[PDB]
From a paper:
CD8 is expressed on the T-cell surface as dimers in two isoforms, the CD8αα homodimer and the CD8αβ heterodimer; both consist of an extracellular immunoglobulin variable (IgV) domain, a stalk region, a transmembrane domain and a cytoplasmic tail. Here, we report the high-resolution crystal structures of chicken, swine and bovine CD8α and confirm that they are capable of forming homodimers. All of them are CD8αα homodimers, and each CD8α exhibited a typical IgV architecture consisting of two anti-parallel sheets. Our results suggest that although CD8α and MHC I sequences change drastically during co-evolution, a few conserved key residues ensure that the CD8α forms dimers and interacts with p/MHC I during at least the co-evolution of endotherm species.
Three extracellular Ig-like domains of chicken, swine and bovine CD8α (cCD8α, sCD8α and bCD8α) were crystallized and diffracted to 2.0 Å, 1.8 Å and 1.8 Å, respectively. The sheets of CD8α are composed of 10 β strands, but there are 11 β strands in sCD8α and bCD8α because their A and G strands are divided into two separate parts. The two artiodactyl CD8αα dimers also have some distinct structural characteristics, and the most notable feature is that they have an additional A’ strand. The two artiodactyl sCD8αα can be discriminated from each other by certain characteristics, such as the longer A’ strand and shorter complementarity determining region 2 (CDR2) loop in sCD8αα. There was a special helix and a short CDR2 loop found in cCD8αα, and the inter-chain hydrogen bonds and the dimer interface area of cCD8αα were minimal. sCD8αα and bCD8αα showed an additional A’ strand, but the A’ strand in sCD8αα was longer. The buried surface areas (BSAs) of cCD8αα, sCD8αα, bCD8αα, mouse CD8αα (mCD8αα), rhesus macaque CD8αα (rCD8αα) and human CD8αα (hCD8αα) are 828.3 Å2, 979.6 Å2, 928.7 Å2, 1048.7 Å2, 1105.5 Å2 and 1026.3 Å2, respectively, indicating that they are tightly binding dimers. The BSAs of sCD8αα and bCD8αα are similar, but there are six hydrogen bonds in sCD8αα and only two hydrogen bonds in bCD8αα, indicating that CD8α dimerization does not mainly rely on hydrogen bonds. Especially for chicken, the four conserved aromatic residues contribute 161 VDW and 262.21 Å2 BSA, which account for 42% and 34% of the total VDW and BSA, respectively. These four aromatic residues can interact with each other; for example, F48 contacts F104 in sCD8αα as well as in other CD8αα. The numbers of residues composing the cCD8αα, sCD8αα and bCD8αα cavities are 7, 7 and 9, and their volumes are 202.0 Å3, 322.9 Å3 and 384.6 Å3, respectively.
Numbering used by the authors:
A (entry chain A), B (entry chain B): 1 to 114
The structure:
Amino acid sequence: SLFRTSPEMVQASLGETVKLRCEVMHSNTLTSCSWLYQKPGAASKPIFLMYLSKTRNKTAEGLDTRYISGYKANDNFYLILHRFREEDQGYYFCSFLSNSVLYFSNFMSVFLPA
Amino acid sequence: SLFRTSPEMVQASLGETVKLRCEVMHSNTLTSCSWLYQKPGAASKPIFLMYLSKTRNKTAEGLDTRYISGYKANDNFYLILHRFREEDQGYYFCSFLSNSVLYFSNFMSVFLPA
C-alpha cells in the first residue's frame, strides 16, 4: 500500500487529544501529503484541512489551528485534534498526488463513545 | 462558488447512459479536474476515476473505459456512465488542485429507482 496509517478506529471523549498518523512509504524530499476530513451522517464533499511538505505547510483558510494542527517528520504525517469537539467526529484521511493520480489513505474514524 | 455541477440528484435505470458535469468557475488560468467516486454504503475512502486536463488525461488503472469515460471541454468536465450498472450507484464529484489546496465540488448522487 502507498499509505500506512495509525489504527483506523479511534474513540475519543470531549476535550481529549487525538493524534493520527499517515506514513507515505517509498518517499523522497518532494513527498507531500494533504489531510482531508469527511463528516458523519449523509455523504458530503471532503474538507481540506492542510497541505504538508518539507518546504511548505499550508492550512485551510478558516481552520482553527488551536484545535486542529499537523506536521511532517521524515516520511510520517500527523494530525492532532487538540481538544476533541463533538463536531470533530468523522473520517480523517490523507491524500497524495503522483503522476496525474490522486491517492487516498484509508479512513481513520474518530467518534465519541456511544 | 468554485464549481457548478449538473443536478445533484440523478435517478437512472440499468443500461441508461448517464452524463454528469462539473464546471470550474473562475478559470483565470488553465484548468484541470479529477473525477472521484464514493460508494453508497459504509463510509470508506473515495476512489479516483480519472484526471482531465488540456495536456494530459489519465484513467485509473483498472477502470473499464467501456462503461466509464470522461472529457474536458473548456472549463466544463464530464463523466459518462455508458451503460449504468447496479455497481455504478453512488456519489460522484470533482476535485481540483490549486496552489497546494484541494478543492471539491458538491456530490452528485446517481441511483436506481427504489
